[PDB]
Write an enzyme that holds these catalytic residues in place. Structure first.
Site, PDB file in Angstrom:
ATOM      1  N   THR D   1       0.890  -1.206   0.000  1.00  0.00           N
ATOM      2  CA  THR D   1       0.000   0.000   0.000  1.00  0.00           C
ATOM      3  C   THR D   1       0.910   1.233   0.000  1.00  0.00           C
ATOM      4  OG1 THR D   1      -1.552  -1.278   1.326  1.00  0.00           O
ATOM      5  CG2 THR D   1      -1.756   1.164   1.452  1.00  0.00           C
ATOM      6  N   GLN D   2       0.742   2.097  -0.967  1.00  0.00           N
ATOM      7  CA  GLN D   2       1.318   3.455  -0.917  1.00  0.00           C
ATOM      8  C   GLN D   2       0.387   4.463  -0.141  1.00  0.00           C
ATOM      9  OE1 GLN D   2       4.487   3.767  -1.762  1.00  0.00           O
ATOM     10  NE2 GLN D   2       4.402   1.584  -2.565  1.00  0.00           N
ATOM     11  N   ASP D  59      -5.092  -4.408   4.103  1.00  0.00           N
ATOM     12  CA  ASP D  59      -3.794  -4.984   4.403  1.00  0.00           C
ATOM     13  C   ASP D  59      -3.907  -5.876   5.601  1.00  0.00           C
ATOM     14  OD1 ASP D  59      -2.472  -3.808   2.234  1.00  0.00           O
ATOM     15  OD2 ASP D  59      -1.585  -2.138   3.525  1.00  0.00           O
ATOM     16  N   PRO D 105       4.940  -1.155   1.727  1.00  0.00           N
ATOM     17  CA  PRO D 105       4.620  -1.641   3.063  1.00  0.00           C
ATOM     18  C   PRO D 105       3.222  -2.182   3.162  1.00  0.00           C
ATOM     19  CG  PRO D 105       4.371   0.744   2.901  1.00  0.00           C
ATOM     20  CD  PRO D 105       5.109   0.340   1.675  1.00  0.00           C
TER      21      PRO D 105
ATOM     22  N   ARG I  91      -4.377  -2.717  -6.199  1.00  0.00           N
ATOM     23  CA  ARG I  91      -5.033  -1.547  -5.551  1.00  0.00           C
ATOM     24  C   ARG I  91      -4.231  -0.273  -6.034  1.00  0.00           C
ATOM     25  NH1 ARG I  91      -4.358  -1.761   0.780  1.00  0.00           N
ATOM     26  NH2 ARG I  91      -5.274   0.377   0.373  1.00  0.00           N
TER      27      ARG I  91
END
Ligand SMILES: *[B]([O])([O])[C]([C][C]([C])[C])[N]C(=O)[C]([N]C(=O)C1=[C][C]=[C]C(C2=[C][C]=[C][C]=[C]2)=N1)[C]([C])[O]
Ligand SMILES: *[B]([O])([O])[C]([C][C]([C])[C])[N]C(=O)[C]([N]C(=O)C1=[C][C]=[C]C(C2=[C][C]=[C][C]=[C]2)=N1)[C]([C])[O]
Ligand SMILES: *[B]([O])([O])[C]([C][C]([C])[C])[N]C(=O)[C]([N]C(=O)C1=[C][C]=[C]C(C2=[C][C]=[C][C]=[C]2)=N1)[C]([C])[O]
Ligand SMILES: [Cl-]
Ligand SMILES: [Cl-]
Ligand SMILES: [Cl-]
Ligand SMILES: [Cl-]
Ligand SMILES: [Cl-]
Ligand SMILES: [Cl-]
Ligand SMILES: [Cl-]
Ligand SMILES: [Cl-]
Ligand SMILES: [Cl-]
Ligand SMILES: [Cl-]
Ligand SMILES: [Cl-]
Ligand SMILES: [Cl-]
Ligand SMILES: [Cl-]
Ligand SMILES: [Cl-]
Ligand SMILES: [Cl-]
Ligand SMILES: [K+]
Ligand SMILES: [K+]
Ligand SMILES: [K+]
Ligand SMILES: [K+]
Ligand SMILES: [K+]
Ligand SMILES: [Mg+2]
Ligand SMILES: [Mg+2]
Ligand SMILES: [Mg+2]
Ligand SMILES: [Mg+2]
Ligand SMILES: [Mg+2]
Ligand SMILES: [Mg+2]
Ligand SMILES: [Mg+2]
Lengths: 220, 203, 196, 216, 204, 213, 200, 196, 202
Positions: D1-2, D59, D105, I91
């Site tokens: 995930t950014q 996440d 991350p 995503r």
């Protein structure tokens, strides 16, 4: 910094730690953060130190001019307005975050004042990098109409929470207790922190330091 | 924030939540966002606390002086106009979404919106602040012409409760005020008194 | 790019400066003079940004001369250095800063010879010797190596020449000629240019 | 995930004599919007171990999928060996570090509680692989609002009973509801002891608003 | 960083009926040393000294502008300025430039001109004053300085011991800082005399 | 911009004696203006003869120490003997340099006994530069500790003093003093001081309380 | 840092300061900046500490392998070339290294400057590092191919000394080596403070 | 900064190049050679970014020498020019571009003398004379003014000298010495360096 | 966009508006945002038209193949899982806020949300897209446990109508679908058939 205030049954208790930092270094272990506004009004300061010092001094000085003229004890609301109108005018560039408390002809009053000029009038407030630790204590333990000693215990617990949990806060706990009848400026109230005992002597004898040049100038 | 005001025959009802935030820390959980500008004229404040407090104190001053001079209660429309002039002139330096509502003897109960940017428009009812997004559909379905004071109070309390549940920047207690020829009646809905709507858990 | 150097002996100050005025890849003048006579016994050597350097040096020069005319005697090298510093420092935070680096060399009847160093920030230091410009990087250690406070003027010109030769050898810019002057109890004397 | 999308706020944990308790509200927020108001942010990992997560909920669901599958794989062997709480905390530290080291991350801060071989385990891991143990933990705003209260009690009395730890957690959850604008007054409490892992909820705290009438 | 362009370090320290103030001697521009006898400590009275570290131009400006104000103060008043009053005078000067400050952070050391009581303080660049009963430090090696002073300082030191402590604190602190040093000057201020020394010191 | 690093505080220190090495650290682990825990030592036993202190970004301290542990066993398996203090130092240099383009944010100091039984200290930068030292401070308060060690252990800037051998007792006193001084001024250093003393007889452990503010 | 070297009748002089810095913090006063590649070959270090140490250590490895495979000493030319070819691949990735490769092989005394920008050049004298400008001034005014041995020692030592004086980033001690036909020798280590005493 | 020049006469090509290797403010070498012998009758002169210049020129040089060894005769100045070009152009959009500017001088048995100009983009132009570097800006118009196609080699060396004197006079960089070589039917000849 | 779905005893109701925009140009005013993924499983799409079309076609392929292999109707939970896997994995490259709803014989009517980011949660009813913001308060006040199919249809049509009036990126017609064991029934509310709520004039 951790600063805080409470309204109790007969007055106001203000509290503060005594650490000042420069970056992540302690510059002052015994900074005084509870500033005189008038004999019946005090103001804790957090944020940029020159700014809180100069702002409280200026408003205190203008208030003394005001009370000299009016012949009356100044009001907390007056200090609040003067502070917030000035802070607003400077658009947050004066980085003074304040807890303002006192007792006037209308009773005890407590305000938090932010750098951009908003204020909140409330029965307990905290400010500074430790303010959430101090506020946790208050939300958990504050009751309306505390007696003096309960209020003092509560404030100093709140300041201790900031001292021990916030790297920006430390050293001593100062309190200021303000009622109709009394002003108790309690500096230090507590000294929960002490430097460890200096385990070695380093007794540097005369001559240890080599000297290139010397001039003695006598005086009268 | 969520603010609202509603006109009825004879007055207005106003309401707000009580949350002040800095980021997502609640710096005041019992803020009074409904500020008296004159005996029978209030503003509801959203946006910057500093800005809306400064602007409200300034207008209060302007309106009070104007009123002494004229020797009459000020018009609600005048209070709105003064907010509008200051919010429009300084629209680049202010973050203020305001509702002015009140009663005067000439036009009765009135609600004006002065949203960011400084336009002004009279409305039957108005909503503003970050939480108002979540109640457009509710207010549009539920509003009725001709509501009584009591209905306006319930309508307002319900709308604000709904917004407060959903908007992270709104919450705490609901402050309400009703304004009419007879004066100003303020109250607080807290805890169990806030209207309640179930989380829609699975069958 | 511009080189200034000064060497103070017991009773004189020797100074030199390159004679190039450059623009982009070309020397546009090879007989440029970077020294400004302030009074009989004071030279101001000035380098830095175009326009600023002349505007600044001439303003100082006119005012030092004005001082002489109003008061019938001249400002001391020290006083002139401080005057120069007050102006630079006062302009630093203004709308009109001057991007100039300077030496001030002088001889006072009572205090003897003096050499002052000033940068564009207006920090002022007195020094027995000093230099400005990229060339300073290659010459200051030559001066540290060989200078002594009692250095005679003959050996100072020699020491100067070692500095200038090091620029011919090692410096990337073409600075082939230098102005050289000395100041003592009898005023300001032009020496032969040092040329390659 | 950014960029985190639906997120959860604080998770709390404290050791007590015979176990560990963790707590987490049931909210997934989408920026300021209190969007999914009945999601569990706590996982029973196995009999000895539980996990709670702040941060990006997708996440977290990925971690849950991965970790759940690892525990099933291990159980299939029927060999007398089980991942201890400490092993799962180790695994999780490596997984977050490794994802951080690829600049991708898993956007979470986690609290692992367990009970095995007579010892209470309580460990933290963040999205960068920072991990440690302590007698009490609190992620997000809890680090500022709850941790000071947990630590103050613990310093007077390092060994708490189960009921004391539960009450202390409830007081912390109340403070969070007062002062974190992304909290919600619907939470779970998970407890691990000798007997296993129990998840209770949905739970609410009592609140007091008397201060609403103390402004004048 | 603006404050490291010239480097430099000053400290002051309190003893028994005496104060000490010290500075390095380097004037340099980034890596380049220009001079090794640059003045950073300036007399503001017979028993009252100010030390300034930071950007050399402002060190000079502040010292000169402060002296302007002090001289006027002393001519107009009956008298020599008190240490605390100098502090306030300097605070006021710096805070005037709150929004475009001078890049210098002074320390003040002296004795009350009537009572001879020791005084030390420092201020930040916008004029926040800090009085202490032990020591104050300012400059590019403040951490090094703090380490040395915290470890060596003791209460009630006589002039000789005060000198050894301030000297050893300075030398060893600046020897861990690339852009401070090239010599150390120390002034010891007593009721009846000022003693000024330069120290044998590393010149790298 | 996700940042893969955060600063977690911590001070480390090692001193080489004639027949001992000390490695010491505080036990605070911080982030931003908060304390994660008051009991997180920064020293790690590598062999009976070698201890390593690590401060900086804790996620890297953990990873790197786990890598070193694995490599010590790999060495021992392939060469049939424990790694020496000097070989651990040299190997650490290459492991740090392998991340030259995404460094381990760790300051490392090794303390131990060399092959003659003498104290040895090796100090590192985050990308693997290193050397042997007589003593070294590292991490958050290093600029505060180093000068004092220079003066008191190195005898720097001192005239008329006999350069005597450093006794364990004096080294110990010094270590406790400098950390106490550091706890006064570095906000990151506090809670407790953990001291490891490496000698021929093994590794022993002392702990001293520091200020909690 | 300041490092220098020069060829002359009697071999090659090699000298360095010993300071390391992290920004303005002095990290060490005792760095060994002259690396013993083999008994007839030295490399000097200036720039990133880890970069210089690693790449010069790798060069030493490669020279040693070479010597084993080929049954003869690597030339100065070939050694310097190995180093340039290794670092060329990393240009633009932020390595910082400036080195002199100093030896004596079949062409006589040998001296090459090699850096992380990709330069590789033979020459009579060089100085490298933040202090180099200061060392060049003194070295250049005293240098001669026919310097006597002890005069060459004096020059090198004095040039590094003077650089330590002007350059904030150079200091500590001056370490001096002499490459002769049968090997390099370590000639002296002099603390700059003890040199200060001497040169006044 | 680096200067290359070439002048082609009826039956020879004369080339020259400065002898400086610079870094920051200093000349680090004053006897630098920027010419690479490719074959008996071909020189490649190469300037540009450090590392790229030698790595590129030596790669060309080895491959041209390889071509000789595989085939027993040498690549013509024109072939070698186009080989050089193909390589530079093929690298332009790759992960390994070479930032180099070149001249290629040669003499072919049948075609006679040739001079080729190439920039870092790998544009190739055959020319009667040419130059690279900032110094080209001050010298190409000297060549335009005085070159003729039948220019003798004695006058070419004179013409070259005019160019080099113009750099001494007018160019801001200190380029005091130049390598000079000529190519003709009998191969590559070293001339005396031109020095100031 | 505004999308919604609601569970009832025996099935689900789905709805959407029909507006596709590029900036504030309406590139399609009668978009069909409810896409059949299998005989009794639909997805409601919001966000990027290109992304949600590509993902839906992909999941339709995966689910169809899986279903033939098993020789049984697919689970709604499986369809949602497959959207989740693809929306979570990608995503960073997709803009897709999805609602999956349908009927299967094992679990009956089900609604799942797969919002941006790729989490998956089952709900009694779900709303999404840019216009959903304006109907949180309305759906939270109006939702009742135990609504019939018909009530779900009206509840959906009203919510969508309210959102459409306020959200510039939603509008056009309301497409509805009901799914149950018996099959899929689709309809369109246009013009006067869209529920109507007065502008509040003075
Ligand atoms: B409502 O619009 O969400 C509410 C209405 C207000 C009380 C009239 N607004 C806020 O809570 C706003 N908060 C502040 O303006 C605020 C209050 C105290 C301090 C600060 C602050 C500002 C800049 C930097 C530091 C602190 N802001 C708003 C939504 O933020
Ligand atoms: B000389 O060139 O001034 C010297 C050369 C020598 C080989 C040491 N170079 C340095 O001092 C360089 N310093 C370092 O590389 C250094 C020293 C200490 C710490 C770190 C470090 C590296 C990565 C991350 C954090 C800290 N680098 C030069 C001055 O920079
Ligand atoms: B709804 O989320 O507002 C709707 C749902 C969709 C139909 C599934 N989305 C849109 O209308 C979006 N529009 C597009 O994705 C779209 C359609 C046609 C062309 C383009 C386009 C994209 C990039 C550059 C040029 C044109 N986009 C809308 C919200 O972005
Ligand atoms: Cl007020
Ligand atoms: Cl603060
Ligand atoms: Cl609230
Ligand atoms: Cl608005
Ligand atoms: Cl609004
Ligand atoms: Cl939910
Ligand atoms: Cl679970
Ligand atoms: Cl002034
Ligand atoms: Cl004054
Ligand atoms: Cl050394
Ligand atoms: Cl080989
Ligand atoms: Cl070469
Ligand atoms: Cl979404
Ligand atoms: Cl959605
Ligand atoms: Cl449409
Ligand atoms: K307010
Ligand atoms: K809320
Ligand atoms: K501390
Ligand atoms: K579509
Ligand atoms: K619409
Ligand atoms: Mg503003
Ligand atoms: Mg200008
Ligand atoms: Mg120093
Ligand atoms: Mg130096
Ligand atoms: Mg603290
Ligand atoms: Mg390249
Ligand atoms: Mg895409």
């Amino acid at each position: 910094t951790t600063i805080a205030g409470v309204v109790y049954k007969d007055g106001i208790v203000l509290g503060a730690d005594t650490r000042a930092t420069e970056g992540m270094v302690v510059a002052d272990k015994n900074c005084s953060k509870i500033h005189f506004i008038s004999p019946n009004i005090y103001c804790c300061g957090a944020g940029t130190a020159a700014d809180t010092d100069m702002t409280t001094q200026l408003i205190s000085s203008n208030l003394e001019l005001h009370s000299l003229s009016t012949g009356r004890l100044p009001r907390v609301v007056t200090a609040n307005r003067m502070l917030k109108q000035m802070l607003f005018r400077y658009q947050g560039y004066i980085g003074a975050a304040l807890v303002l408390g006192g007792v006037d002809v209308t009773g005890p009053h407590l305000y938090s004042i932010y750098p951009h000029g908003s204020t909140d009038k409330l029965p307990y407030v905290t400010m500074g990098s430790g303010s959430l630790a101090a506020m946790a204590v208050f939300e958990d333990k504050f009751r309306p109409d505390m007696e003096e000693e309960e209020a003092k215990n509560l404030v100093s617990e709140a300041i201790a929470a900031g001292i021990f949990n916030d790297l920006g806060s430390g050293s001593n706990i100062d309190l200021c207790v303000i009622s109709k009848n009394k002003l108790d400026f309690l500096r230090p109230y507590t000294v929960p922190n002490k430097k460890g005992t200096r385990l070695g002597r380093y007794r540097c004898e005369k001559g240890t330091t080599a000297v290139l040049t010397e001039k003695i100038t006598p005086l009268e | 924030t969520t603010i609202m005001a509603v006109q009825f025959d004879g007055g207005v009802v106003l309401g707000a939540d009580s949350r002040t935030t800095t980021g997502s820390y609640i710096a005041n959980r019992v803020t009074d966002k409904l500020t008296p500008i004159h005996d029978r004229i209030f503003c509801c404040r959203s946006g910057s606390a500093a800005d809306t407090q400064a602007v409200a104190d300034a207008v209060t001053y302007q309106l009070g002086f104007h009123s002494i001079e004229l020797n009459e209660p000020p018009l609600v429309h005048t209070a709105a106009s003064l907010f509008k002039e200051m919010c429009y002139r300084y629209r680049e330096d202010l973050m203020a979404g305001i509702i002015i509502a009140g009663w005067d003897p000439q036009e009765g109960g009135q609600v004006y919106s002065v949203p960011m940017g400084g336009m002004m428009v009279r409305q039957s009812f108005a909503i503003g602040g970050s939480g108002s997004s979540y109640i457009y559909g509710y207010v549009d379905a539920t509003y009725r012409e001709g509501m009584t004071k009591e209905e306006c109070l319930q309508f307002t309390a319900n709308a604000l409760a709904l917004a407060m549940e959903r908007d992270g920047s709104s919450g705490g207690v609901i402050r309400l005020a009703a304004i009419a020829e007879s004066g100003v009646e303020r109250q607080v809905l807290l805890g169990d008194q806030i209207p309640k709507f179930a989380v829609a858990t699975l069958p | 790019m511009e080189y200034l150097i000064g060497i103070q002996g017991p009773d004189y100050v020797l100074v030199a400066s390159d004679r190039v005025a450059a623009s982009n890849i070309v020397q546009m003048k090879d007989d440029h003079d970077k020294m400004f006579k302030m009074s009989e016994k004071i030279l101001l050597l000035c380098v830095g940004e175009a326009g600023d350097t002349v505007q600044f040096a001439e303003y100082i020069q006119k005012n030092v001369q004005l001082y002489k005319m109003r008061n019938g005697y001249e400002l001391s090298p020290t006083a002139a250095a401080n005057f120069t510093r007050r102006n630079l420092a006062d302009c630093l935070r203004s709308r009109t800063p001057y991007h100039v680096n300077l030496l001030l060399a002088g001889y006072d009847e009572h205090e003897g010879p003096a050499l002052y160093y000033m940068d564009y920030l207006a920090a002022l230091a007195k020094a027995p010797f000093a230099a400005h410009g990229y060339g300073a990087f290659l010459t200051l250690s030559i001066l540290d190596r060989y200078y002594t406070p009692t250095i005679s003027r003959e050996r100072a010109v020699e020491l100067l020449r070692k500095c200038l030769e090091e620029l011919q050898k090692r410096f990337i810019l073409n600075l082939p000629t230098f102005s050289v002057r000395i100041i003592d109890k009898n005023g300001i004397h032009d020496l032969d240019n040092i040329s390659f | 995930t950014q960029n985190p999308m639906v997120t959860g706020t604080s998770v709390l944990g404290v050791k007590f004599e015979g176990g560990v308790v963790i707590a987490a509200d049931m909210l997934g927020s989408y920026g300021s919007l209190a969007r999914f108001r009945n999601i569990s942010r706590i996982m029973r990992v196995n009999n000895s171990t539980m996990l709670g997560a702040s941060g990006d909920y997708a996440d977290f669901q990925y971690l849950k999928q991965v970790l759940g599958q690892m525990v099933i794989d291990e159980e299939l062997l029927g060999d007398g060996h089980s991942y201890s709480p400490r092993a799962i905390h180790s695994w999780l530290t490596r997984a977050m570090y490794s994802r951080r080291s690829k600049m991708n991350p898993l956007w979470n801060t986690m609290v692992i509680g367990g009970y095995a071989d007579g010892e209470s385990f309580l460990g933290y891991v963040d999205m960068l692989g920072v991990a440690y143990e302590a007698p009490s933990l609190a992620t997000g705003y809890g680090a500022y609002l709850a941790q000071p209260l947990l630590r103050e009690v613990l310093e007077k009395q390092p060994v708490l009973s189960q009921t004391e730890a539960r009450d202390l957690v409830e007081r912390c959850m109340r403070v969070l509801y007062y002062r974190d604008a992304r909290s919600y007054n619907r939470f779970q409490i998970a407890t691990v002891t000798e007997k296993g892992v129990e998840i209770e909820g949905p739970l609410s705290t009592e609140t007091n608003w008397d201060i609403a009438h103390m402004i004048s | 960083s603006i404050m490291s362009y010239n480097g430099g370090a000053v400290m002051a320290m309190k003893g028994k009926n005496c104060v000490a103030i010290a500075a390095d001697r380097r004037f340099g521009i980034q890596a380049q040393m220009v001079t090794t006898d640059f003045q950073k400590i300036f007399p503001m009275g017979d028993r009252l000294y100010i030390g300034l570290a930071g950007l050399a131009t402002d060190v000079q400006t502040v010292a000169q502008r402060l002296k302007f104000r002090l001289n006027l103060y002393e001519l107009k008043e009956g008298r020599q300025i008190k240490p605390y009053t100098l502090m306030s005078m300097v605070a006021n000067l710096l805070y005037e430039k709150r929004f475009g400050p001078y890049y210098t952070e002074p320390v003040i050391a002296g004795l009350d001109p009537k009572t001879f009581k020791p005084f030390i303080c420092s201020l930040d660049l916008i004029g926040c004053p800090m009085v202490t009963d032990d020591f104050v430090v300012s400059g590019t090696c403040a951490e090094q300085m703090y380490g040395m002073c915290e470890s060596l300082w003791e209460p009630n030191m006589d002039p000789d011991h005060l000198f050894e402590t301030i000297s050893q604190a300075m030398l060893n602190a600046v020897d861990r800082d690339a852009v401070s040093g090239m010599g150390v000057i120390v002034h010891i201020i007593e009721k009846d005399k000022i003693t000024t020394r330069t120290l044998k010191a590393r010149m790298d | 911009r996700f940042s893969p690093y955060v600063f977690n505080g911590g001070t480390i220190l090692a001193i080489a004696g004639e027949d001992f090495a000390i490695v010491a650290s505080d036990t605070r682990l911080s982030e931003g203006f908060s304390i994660h825990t008051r009991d997180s030592p920064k020293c790690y036993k590598l062999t009976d003869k070698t201890v390593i202190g690590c401060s900086g970004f804790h996620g890297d301290c953990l990873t790197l120490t786990k890598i070193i542990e694995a490599r010590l066993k790999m060495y021992k398996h392939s060469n049939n003997k424990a790694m020496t203090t000097g070989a651990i130092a040299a190997m650490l240099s290459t492991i740090l340099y392998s991340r030259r383009f995404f460094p381990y944010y760790v300051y490392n100091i090794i303390g131990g006994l060399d092959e003659e039984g003498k104290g040895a200290v090796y100090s590192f930068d985050p990308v693997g530069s290193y050397q042997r030292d007589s003593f070294k401070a590292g991490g958050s308060a290093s600029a505060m500790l180093q000068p004092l060690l220079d003066n008191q252990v190195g005898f720097k800037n001192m005239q008329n003093v006999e350069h005597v051998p450093l006794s364990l007792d004096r080294a110990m006193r010094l270590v406790k003093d400098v950390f106490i001084s550091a706890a006064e001024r570095d906000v990151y250093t506090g809670d407790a001081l953990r001291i490891c003393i490496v000698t021929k007889e093994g590794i022993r452990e002392e702990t001293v309380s520091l200020r909690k503010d | 840092t300041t490092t220098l070297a020069f060829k002359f009748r009697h071999g090659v002089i090699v000298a360095a300061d010993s300071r390391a810095t992290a920004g303005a913090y002095i990290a060490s006063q005792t760095v060994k900046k002259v690396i013993e590649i083999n008994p007839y070959l030295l490399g000097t270090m200036a720039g990133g500490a880890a970069d210089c140490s690693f790449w010069e250590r790798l060069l030493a490895r490669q020279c040693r392998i070479y010597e084993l495979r080929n049954k003869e000493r690597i030339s100065v030319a070939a050694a310097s070339k190995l180093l340039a070819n290794m670092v060329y691949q990393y240009k633009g990735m932020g390595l910082s290294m400036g080195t002199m490769i100093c030896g004596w092989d079949k062409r006589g005394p040998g001296l090459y400057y090699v850096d992380s920008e990709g330069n590789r050049i033979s020459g009579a004298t060089f100085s490298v590092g933040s202090g180099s400008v200061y060392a060049y001034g003194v070295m250049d005014r005293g240098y001669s191919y026919d310097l006597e041995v002890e005069q060459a020692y004096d020059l090198a030592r004095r040039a590094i000394y003077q650089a330590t004086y002007r350059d904030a980033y150079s200091g500590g001690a001056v370490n001096l080596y002499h490459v002769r036909e049968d090997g390099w020798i370590r000639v002296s280590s002099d603390n700059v403070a003890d040199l200060h005493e001497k040169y006044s």
